[PDB]
Design a protein around this ligand. Structure first.
Ligand SMILES: Nc1ncnc2c1ncn2[C@@H]1O[C@H](COP(=O)(O)OP(=O)(O)O)[C@@H](O)[C@H]1O
Ligand SMILES: [Mg+2]
Length: 188
C-alpha cells in the first residue's frame, strides 16, 4: 500500500509521518513491510522547488523522478510505503495513484497542516537557527511561492481519495482514529 503525505512547507509532514510509521509498526506486529521515503532520505534539497537549455542541476521534475523510482522499488501489495514529501501537485498525486494501481495495491492521501501562519512561523525559527535534514529551512522566497502554488487535495477526484487530514491541534486519539481508517483503507 501507498500513503501519500501532503502539505505545505514546514506544515508537519515529517512529524506526522513518523507517528504514522510508529503506528503502522505496532499494527503490523500487532503481514506487511514498512517503508519510509522523503526528500531527505533521497538527499533532495528543498531548493529544487524554486527551460530551453539542458542544465546539470537537478530540477523539481527530477525530484519527482527520484521519488517515483524510490516508491516503485519497494511499493507492493505486501509493502506499505509512506511518502513524506510536499506532493503538492494534483498531476503528481495522480502519477502516484497510477503507480499504486500498477503495483496492484491501494493508495490514499494524508494531508497535514496547522495553518499557513503556524507553518510560516516554523520556517522562520529554522531560518533563525543557523543539508539532507528534516529541519533545514527553505529560503523565504522558495517558501512563499511553494504555498501559493499548493494544490489542495480534492476528494471529488479518485486519485486524491481516500483523503485524510491531521491538524496540529488534533490530539493523539483523533490522530489515532485517522490512522485506523488509513489501515482499514489499505486492507481488503
Ligand atoms: N501537531 C504539531 N504540533 C506541534 N508542532 C508541530 C506539529 N507538527 C509539526 N510541528 C512542528 O513544527 C516543525 C515542523 O515540523 P516538520 O514535520 O519537520 O515539518 P515538514 O513537513 O516541513 O517536514 C517541527 O519543529 C515540529 O516540531
Ligand atoms: Mg518532511
Amino acid at each position: 500500500p501507498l500513503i501519500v503525505v501532503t502539505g505545505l512547507p514546514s506544515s508537519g509532514k515529517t512529524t506526522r509521518a513518523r507517528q504514522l510509521y510508529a503506528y503502522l509498526e505496532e499494527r503490523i506486529a500487532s503481514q506487511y513491510r514498512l517503508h519510509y521515503i522523503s526528500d531527505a532520505t533521497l538527499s533532495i534539497s528543498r531548493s529544487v522547488y524554486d527551460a530551453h537549455v539542458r542544465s546539470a542541476n537537478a530540477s523539481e521534475k527530477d525530484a519527482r523522478a527520484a521519488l517515483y523510482a524510490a516508491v516503485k522499488r519497494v511499493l507492493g501489495p505486501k509493502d506499505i510505503v509512506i511518502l513524506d514529501s510536499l506532493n503538492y501537485i494534483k498531476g503528481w498525486r495522480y502519477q502516484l495513484y497510477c503507480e499504486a494501481k500498477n503495483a496492484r495495491t491501494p493508495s490514499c492521501v494524508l494531508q497535514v497542516g496547522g495553518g499557513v501562519e503556524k507553518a510560516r512561523e516554523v520556517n522562520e525559527r529554522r531560518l533563525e537557527r543557523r543539508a539532507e535534514s528534516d529541519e533545514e529551512p527553505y529560503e523565504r522566497s522558495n517558501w512563499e511561492n511553494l504555498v501559493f502554488r499548493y494544490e489542495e487535495p480534492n476528494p471529488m477526484t479518485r486519485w486524491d481519495s481516500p483523503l485524510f487530514l491531521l491538524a496540529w491541534d488534533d490530539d493523539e486519539a483523533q490522530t489515532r482514529q485517522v490512522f485506523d481508517k488509513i489501515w482499514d483503507a489499505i486492507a481488503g
